[PDB]
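Suppose a colleague, Dr. K., hands you the sequence of a protein chain of 118 amino acids and asks what its three-dimensional shape might be. Before reaching for any lab equipment, you can write down a predicted structure in token form. Begin with the sequence itself:
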Amino acid sequence: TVVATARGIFNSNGGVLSSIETGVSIIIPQGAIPEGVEQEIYFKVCRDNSILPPLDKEKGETLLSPLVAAGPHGLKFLKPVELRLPHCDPKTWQNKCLPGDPNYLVGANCVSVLIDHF
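The predicted structure, expressed as tokens, is then:
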């Protein structure tokens, strides 16, 4: 329970993989996947590590956030795909940053992480 899973195929056209049940999402910028191809991408986000529902362990699990298992371990990309996950830690904003600049913290709600090799 309390688990959010999202499985779906992508293409060079572009798309996104988001799980409202959790929040984490994955944007596929036009160019991450080759044309005339279908890249099956999925992932499961959840606060519980033991409550994780069986998806595809033997297939290959690639953890990203506190507990988020991407699709099959080993999925190259021809473009830095956008991945967003909850940080849950305000210790990456206050560090000699700009007092009048939003960049000093306007990125705590979600961690912008690019993936070019699963």
